[PDB]
Amino acid sequence: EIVLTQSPATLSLSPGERATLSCRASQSVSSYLAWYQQKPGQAPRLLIYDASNRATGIPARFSGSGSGTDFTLTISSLEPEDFAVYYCQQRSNWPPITFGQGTRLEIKRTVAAPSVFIFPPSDEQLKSGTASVVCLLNNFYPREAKVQWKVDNALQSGNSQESVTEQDSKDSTYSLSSTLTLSKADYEKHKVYACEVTHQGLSSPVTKSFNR
Amino acid sequence: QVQLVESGGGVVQPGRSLRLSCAASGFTFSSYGMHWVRQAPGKGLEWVAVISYDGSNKYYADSVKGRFTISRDNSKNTLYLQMNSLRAEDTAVYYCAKDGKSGLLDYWGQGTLVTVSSASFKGPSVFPLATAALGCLVKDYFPEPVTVSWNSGALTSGVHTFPAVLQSSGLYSLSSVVTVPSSSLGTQTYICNVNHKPSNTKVDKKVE
């Protein structure tokens, strides 16, 4: 088993920039190193084979170097095309065949604050003996944020789920939904309901809240 | 003209069986050797198995062995995955790949999705979420996937349809949102159109 390491995880870049991608082996894999492109909801595709070789149909913006433990992926000028996920893989020592974990290429943009929205549970859910509390994080950059739930000032762990959008193709934004799950009974017992938003581009953190 | 098409996936119960297929066109299937790779949700690549030339030689990843078998009908050009004893974690898109002429994955297919659940087929409930934001809450459905529309597709703009969560339940939940002029709003009607096909479930929800 070769461990492959990809650095960074995330690359945040503009179009036209040079792109440089890294892959470290755990022992020498010699020259046996591949690179793979995966655009979203598609499959993998081969870029580089054996460090240094272009695959068919693969444009010349795409490049690689290295030997032993040390590998590079080169893109010369970013097409927007190229903002994707990139994997490395060894054929030196297998099985198992191994992959890198991925680098993702993000569009880099100006820092954007969220956009914060709170949703009380509906009416109609209330009956199913449902209750969902919903907090919205609108169109923000970069991707790291933090939600905190609070119920009558008790903060909530383990009771929550969150999702994130893909990068906005016009905005280059991210959005997030947080779901607070909760008993009807619990719901009723409590008064104050509160989503607390912590982000890079806020002076301070934002709190959206409601009284049941 | 190299094509690969996977078939065979499914919802499948923990403990059971599932066969996958990989139809090759375009090349010497029979000269190649073949793999399967797998892609859990939110997650990276994971090599599963390899079959030779010849059928003679078969390697398996550790997490799979004794459960999975790799095989091959050369002469209907087809690659096979037999999955016994399915667990929860075997949930993944399953890709078939062509070995080059190696350990190199030359050509991949588009994949086929395998979902491993004791959970019962279900439609969603569709709750309302009332510079303005609005949307719909799509609770407690199984399985994937689901579609959202706003105003029959006439609203596109300021739309966020969020990826689904799994549920302790084993049901899915989700959100679609939209931002809008507070202006509008008196006055413009908003309806989220929800399609959940594996249940034959359609819901139209006015939010106001």
Mutation site for B-interface testing, chosen from A115, A177, A181 by largest number of B Cβ within 10 Å:
A177
Q: Exposure string (b/e) for A131-160, b if CB count within 10 Å is 16 or more?
A: bbbbbbbbbbbbbebebbbbbeeeebeeeb
Neighbours of B158 (CB within 10 A): 16
Using the structure block, give the residue that is written with the tokens 């969150």.
Answer: A162
Among all residues of chain B, which has the CA nearest to that of A46?
B106
The candidate with the shortest Cα–Cα distance to A83, out of A61, A56, A110, is A61
* The domain boundary residue, chosen from A53, A77, A109: A109
Most distant pair of Cα atoms in chain A: their distance: 65
Collapsing DSSP to helix, strand or coil, A166 comes out as coil
Report the DSSP beta bridge partners of residue A194.
A150, A209
Residues A150 and A85 in one domain: no
Residues in CB range of A67: below 8 A, 6 or more apart: A30, A31, A51
| Alpha-carbon B16 to chain mean position | 19
Taking CB atoms and an 8 Å limit, are B133 and A138 in contact across chains? Answer: yes
Q: Which domain holds residue A72?
A: 1-109
* The domain boundary residue, chosen from A75, A91, A109: A109
What residue ranges define each of the domains in chain B, with the CATH number in brackets? 1-118 (2.60.40.10), 119-208 (2.60.40.10)
The whole-angstrom separation of Cα B107 and Cα B34 is: 10
The candidate with the shortest Cα–Cα distance to B46, out of A97, A202, A31, A142, is A97
Collapsing DSSP to helix, strand or coil, A99 comes out as strand
Residues A120 and A105 in one domain: no
The whole-angstrom separation of Cα A194 and Cα A208 is: 6
The answer to whether the Cα torsion of B166, A101, B85, B112 is positive or negative is positive
The whole-angstrom separation of Cα B208 and Cα B187 is: 10
Chain B (170-199) residues lying within 8 Å, Cβ to Cβ, of chain A = 173-175, 177, 179
Taking CB atoms and an 8 Å limit, are B103 and A49 in contact across chains? Answer: no
* The domain boundary residue, chosen from A76, A109, A142: A109
Q: Enumerate helices (H) and strands (E) in chain B, giving the number of each.
A: 1, 19
The whole-angstrom separation of Cα A163 and Cα B137 is: 13
Does B203 contact A at CB distance below 8 Å? no
Upper half-sphere CA count for residue B101 (Cβ side, 13 Å): 6
Residue type, A199: H
Q: Tokens at residue A183, please?
A: 């008993």
Most distant pair of Cα atoms in chain B: their distance: 70
Residue type, A52: S
Among all residues of chain B, which has the CA nearest to that of A103?
B44
Taking CB atoms and an 8 Å limit, are B105 and A34 in contact across chains? Answer: yes
| Through-space distance between the first and last CA atoms of chain A, rounded to whole angstroms | 55
In terms of Cβ atoms closer than 10 Å to its own Cβ (0-12, 13-18, 19+), residue B22 is buried
Residues A98 and A151 in one domain: no
Query: Cα distance from A57 to chain B (closest Cα, Å)?
Result: 12
Residues A86 and A121 in one domain: no
Strand-by-strand arrangement of the A206-211 sheet:
A154-155, A146-151, A192-198, A206-211
Residues A123 and A29 in one domain: no
In terms of Cβ atoms closer than 10 Å to its own Cβ (0-12, 13-18, 19+), residue A40 is exposed
Phi-psi region of A51 (alpha: psi -120 to 50; beta: other; left: phi over 0): left
The whole-angstrom separation of Cα B19 and Cα B34 is: 16
Write the DSSP symbol of residue B81. Answer: E
Taking CB atoms and an 8 Å limit, are B106 and A125 in contact across chains? Answer: no
- CB of A39 within 8 A of CB of A167? no
The candidate with the shortest Cα–Cα distance to A149, out of A139, A161, A141, is A161
The answer to whether the Cα torsion of A162, A166, A169, A174 is positive or negative is positive
Strands (E), chain A: 5-7, 10-13, 19-24, 33-38, 45-49, 53-54, 62-67, 70-75, 85-90, 98-99, 103-107, 115-119, 132-140, 146-151, 154-155, 160-164, 174-181, 192-198, 206-211
Taking CB atoms and an 8 Å limit, are A130 and B139 in contact across chains? Answer: yes
Query: Cα distance from B45 to chain A (closest Cα, Å)?
Result: 6
Cis peptide before B145 (omega within 30 of 0): yes
Residues A105 and A126 in one domain: no
Query: Cα distance from B128 to chain A (closest Cα, Å)?
Result: 6
The whole-angstrom separation of Cα A60 and Cα A47 is: 10
Residues A45 and A144 in one domain: no
Using the structure block, give the residue that is written with the tokens 């953190």.
Answer: A205
- CB of B156 within 8 A of CB of B104? no
Neighbours of B3 (CB within 10 A): 12
Q: Tokens at residue B201, please?
A: 């479930």
On chain A, the residues whose CB falls within 8 A of the CB of B62 are 96
The whole-angstrom separation of Cα A28 and Cα A2 is: 9
Strand-by-strand arrangement of the A160-164 sheet:
A115-119, A132-140, A174-181, A160-164
Report the DSSP beta bridge partners of residue A3.
none
- Which secondary-structure segment (H or E) carries A185? helix A184-189
Residues in CB range of A142: below 8 A, 6 or more apart: A12, A106, A109, A111, A174, A200
The candidate with the shortest Cα–Cα distance to B38, out of B102, B78, B96, is B96
On chain A, the residues whose CB falls within 8 A of the CB of B208 are none
Chain breaks in chain B (C to N over 2.5 A) after: 101, 130
Neighbours of A102 (CB within 10 A): 18
On chain B, the residues whose CB falls within 8 A of the CB of A98 are 47
Residues in CB range of B40: below 8 A, 6 or more apart: B46, B89, B91, B92, B93
The whole-angstrom separation of Cα A135 and Cα B177 is: 11
Residues A86 and A117 in one domain: no
Residues A95 and A121 in one domain: no
Collapsing DSSP to helix, strand or coil, A158 comes out as coil
- CB of B35 within 8 A of CB of B70? no
Experimental method: X-ray
Using the structure block, give the residue that is written with the tokens 């949307």.
Answer: B135
The candidate with the shortest Cα–Cα distance to A166, out of A105, A98, A99, A95, is A105
Residues in CB range of B25: below 8 A, 6 or more apart: B1, B2, B3, B4, B77
Residues in CB range of A154: below 8 A, 6 or more apart: none
Residues A2 and A105 in one domain: yes
Domain CATH code at residue A161? 2.60.40.10
The domain tally of chain A equals 2
Taking CB atoms and an 8 Å limit, are A134 and B59 in contact across chains? Answer: no
Query: Cα distance from A97 to chain B (closest Cα, Å)?
Result: 6
Residues A166 and A199 in one domain: yes
On chain B, the residues whose CB falls within 8 A of the CB of A34 are 104-105
Cis peptide before A96 (omega within 30 of 0): yes
The whole-angstrom separation of Cα B145 and Cα B129 is: 21
Cis peptide before A142 (omega within 30 of 0): yes
Taking CB atoms and an 8 Å limit, are A136 and B139 in contact across chains? Answer: no
Q: What are phi and psi of B95, to 5 degrees?
A: -95, 145
The whole-angstrom separation of Cα A46 and Cα A34 is: 8
Alpha-carbon radius of gyration of chain A: 22
Mutation site for B-interface testing, chosen from A32, A163, A178 by largest number of B Cβ within 10 Å:
A163
The candidate with the shortest Cα–Cα distance to B79, out of B37, B29, B28, is B29
